[PDB]
């Protein structure tokens, strides 16, 4: 949300004034603004983000580093050029054959001319070369492994959905990654960093006291269970022990989505790519029950509720336990002076803050009067507006922050006492929740099966999720397949047996990649990563688990058994470890219902939005649809006695309860509002009988 370029605002163009030509990618954006990452709504191109290496000219332009090359000798003098000198000069590529001396190898070299043209210059006129690959791309987009295989649409979706993951309770690091998980975590701020070197004195879950090498000590306080700005947890647990020596600029304490320093936006799950029983139909995803049992995907959500005890014309409000008509049953959680006790679990509709207002004198209905005459309960002139926890929410109560006028705290005018109650729950993963990988392959949870009716391997290990095949070839995102195979390679660990020299694929691999351990972390950078021949070479020798058992052959597939029926599948199926996230589009934030609730003020429609109850807008196109069916009575229903027939609604509710027929609908209310507005504009409007 920092590093964001936004072309709309005051002094800038708005979205209705926005033409189509400003939203494209001009060829001067290369190295100055990422072409991938942009919000996929109605803001495509108006909002962007800076490049990785980009740096701001003092006149407000966007400079970019370049390696200058003199006479075909690539130097190291790094010169920042803005887009004008990017057009003056000529610009080479970083994936070019530099012959270990600054010298190019082949004379015919890719280059960029001024107007975005791409040519083959002879290797003598090249005066600038790029500083690395992945220069064109943003921060978040450079965290996508195998990005160069994916199409730009699904890579765009992946970059916009990688910013939406929620902090899990465990936060395990990804196996296959980029370089940008460590650097873009210690630069993100939410990781406590050892300021100056030294040794650890005292750790806890709350503070770390470092011992600097010269006398001084310093306590790094944590942030435990603080609410974020979108309701998610912000825990910081330490990762150092009491005798460790730290250096300056070291990670000392993981943040929300971090793990031993680097980013962890999700977990590493065993995936398989068959279409299973129609539950993974059209982007839907199934899961094991192991993810629910072992709390693999589980996020802590923290919600802030707030009430103020303000002044009024009749008198003054009061936070207290003397509420009105309410069984001393629900007054068990509340303390002696209002608010609930810390740790008492609440449900939807419970009392949080006992708070009662005066009402005045209103004459009673006679039936209410005689009920008070029979039972002897008094009038109780105060009226109760307590802070009730809203519908469809529950969970524990972490902390109660209370203010007061009596402590002389800063409160606005006419407010006597403020209190905030933090409520928190621990959401399991559930069907309907939104999951996605790092490749734009989103999809809701179709069905959480048990662990036994899940396709397990020959080693009795069940798979954990099952994606669909039909979403792969038509969306052009086989980065998920390359991630899947390389993830299995990194899970099992390889050993290129270089007994008689090095094999032909593995020649230009780096050293200490000739063999690897199980659960060893790997990384491909974005535009210089695992080649496909290298993936076949790693996948060929992928040393067995515990027995002599190569579960995944050279093709990258395996013989799954059906957990439900029992027969083996007749064809081998791709398996592997894919790194998937839990998006912030949970079902519990979306489900909503209304029978009868609050009503709008001027017009008499039901209100709007999940904050209130509200109904869904039965808009104009739906009116056309039900006209086109010819359903006339349901249209009369939905436009009179569900929305605006003010005397009709209570008759409908009464007739439903009494079990009678629904009465005949009357005139809507917004028509009458229209009638009085037209009579206000000096237009004689009248209804004529015959």
């Amino acid at each position: 949300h920092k590093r964001r370029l936004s072309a709309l605002g005051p002094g800038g163009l708005s979205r209705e004034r926005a033409g189509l030509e400003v939203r494209d990618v001009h060829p001067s954006h290369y190295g100055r603004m990422c072409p991938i990452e942009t919000p996929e709504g109605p803001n495509i191109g108006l909002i962007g983000s800076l490049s990785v290496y980009a740096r701001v000219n003092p006149f407000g332009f966007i400079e970019t580093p370049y390696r200058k090359v003199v006479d075909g000798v690539v130097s190291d003098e790094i010169v920042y050029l803005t887009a004008d000198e990017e057009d003056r000069h000529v610009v080479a590529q970083a994936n070019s054959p530099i012959d270990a001396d600054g010298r190019f190898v082949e004379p015919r070299v890719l280059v960029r001319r001024k107007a975005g043209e791409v040519e083959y210059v002879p290797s003598s006129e090249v005066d600038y070369m790029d500083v690395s690959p992945r220069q064109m791309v943003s921060v978040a987009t450079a965290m996508i492994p195998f990005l160069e295989h994916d199409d730009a649409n699904r890579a765009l979706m992946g970059a916009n959905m990688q910013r939406q993951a929620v902090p899990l309770v465990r936060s395990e690091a990804p196996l296959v990654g980029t370089g940008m998980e460590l650097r873009a975590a210690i630069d993100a701020g939410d990781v406590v960093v050892a300021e100056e070197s030294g040794v650890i004195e005292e750790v806890s879950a709350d503070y770390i006291t470092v011992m600097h090498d010269n006398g001084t000590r310093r306590t790094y306080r944590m942030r435990k269970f603080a609410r974020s700005n979108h309701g998610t947890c912000a825990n910081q647990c330490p990762i150092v022990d009491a005798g460790d020596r730290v250096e300056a600029g070291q990670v000392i304490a993981d943040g929300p989505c971090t793990d031993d320093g680097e980013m962890a936006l999700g977990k590493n799950l065993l995936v398989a790519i068959m279409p299973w029983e129609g539950h993974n139909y059209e982007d839907a995803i199934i899961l094991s029950n192991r993810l629910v049992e072992e709390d693999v995907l589980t996020s802590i959500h923290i919600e802030e509720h707030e009430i103020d005890a303000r002044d009024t014309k009749l008198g003054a409000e009061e936070i207290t336990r003397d509420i009105p008509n309410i069984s001393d049953e629900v007054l068990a959680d509340l303390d002696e002076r209002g608010i609930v006790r810390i740790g008492a679990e609440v449900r939807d509709g419970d009392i949080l803050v006992g708070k009662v207002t005066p009402k005045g004198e209103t004459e009673l209905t006679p039936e209410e009067r005689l009920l008070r005459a029979i039972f002897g309960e008094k009038a109780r002139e105060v009226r109760d507006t307590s802070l009730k926890v809203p519908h469809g929410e529950s969970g524990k109560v972490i902390g109660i922050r209370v203010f007061s006028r009596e402590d002389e705290d800063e409160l606005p005018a006419g407010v006597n006492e403020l209190v905030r109650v933090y409520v928190a729950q621990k959401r399991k993963i559930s069907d309907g929740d939104k999951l996605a990988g790092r490749h734009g392959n989103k999809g809701v949870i179709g069905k959480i099966l048990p662990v036994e009716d899940m396709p397990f391997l020959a080693d009795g290990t069940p798979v954990d999720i099952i994606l669909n095949t039909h979403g792969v070839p038509r969306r052009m995102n086989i980065g998920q397949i390359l991630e899947t195979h390389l993830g299995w390679c990194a899970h099992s660990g390889w050993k290129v047996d270089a007994a008689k020299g090095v094999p032909d694929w593995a020649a230009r691999l780096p050293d200490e990649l000739l063999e690897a351990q199980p659960n060893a972390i790997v990384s491909t950078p974005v535009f210089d990563g695992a080649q496909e021949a290298e993936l076949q070479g790693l996948l060929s020798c992928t040393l067995p688990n515990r027995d002599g058992d190569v579960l995944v052959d050279a093709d990258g597939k395996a013989m799954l058994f059906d957990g439900r029926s029992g027969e083996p599948f007749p064809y081998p199926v791709t398996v592997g470890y894919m790194y998937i996230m839990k998006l912030h589009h949970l079902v519990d934030d979306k489900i909503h219902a209304r029978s009868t609730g609050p009503y709008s003020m001027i017009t008499q429609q039901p209100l709007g939005g999940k904050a209130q109850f509200g109904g869904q807008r039965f808009g104009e196109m739906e009116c056309w649809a039900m006209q086109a069916y010819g359903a006339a009575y349901t249209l009369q229903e939905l436009l009179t006695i569900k929305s605006d027939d003010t005397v009709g609604r209570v008759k409908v509710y009464e007739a439903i309860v009494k079990g009678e027929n629904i009465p005949e609908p009357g005139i809507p209310e917004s028509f009458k509002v229209l009638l009085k507005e037209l009579q206000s504009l000096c237009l004689n409007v009248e209804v004529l009988s015959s």
């Binding site: 920092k2 590093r3 800076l50 990785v52 290496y53 740096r55 701001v56 580093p65 390696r67 190291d76 790094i78 970083a94 994936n95 500083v131 690395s132 690959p133 921060v139 690091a173 990654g177 370089g179 940008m180 998980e181 460590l182 650097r183 873009a184 210690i186 630069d187 701020g189 730290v246 250096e247 300056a248 600029g249 070291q250 990670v251 000392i252 031993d260 320093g261 680097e262 230009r508 691999l509 780096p510 200490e512 990649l513 690897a516 060893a520 972390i521 790997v522 990384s523 491909t524 950078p525 210089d528 990563g529 695992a530 290298e534």
Partner: peptide, 27 residues
Amino acid sequence: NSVPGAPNRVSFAKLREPLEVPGLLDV
């Protein structure tokens, strides 16, 4: 590397970058 308590994550990078990633909040 150049970050002291980093995890050991092996890279497939065939090239070498001269310039480090800058101070990502400088803007």
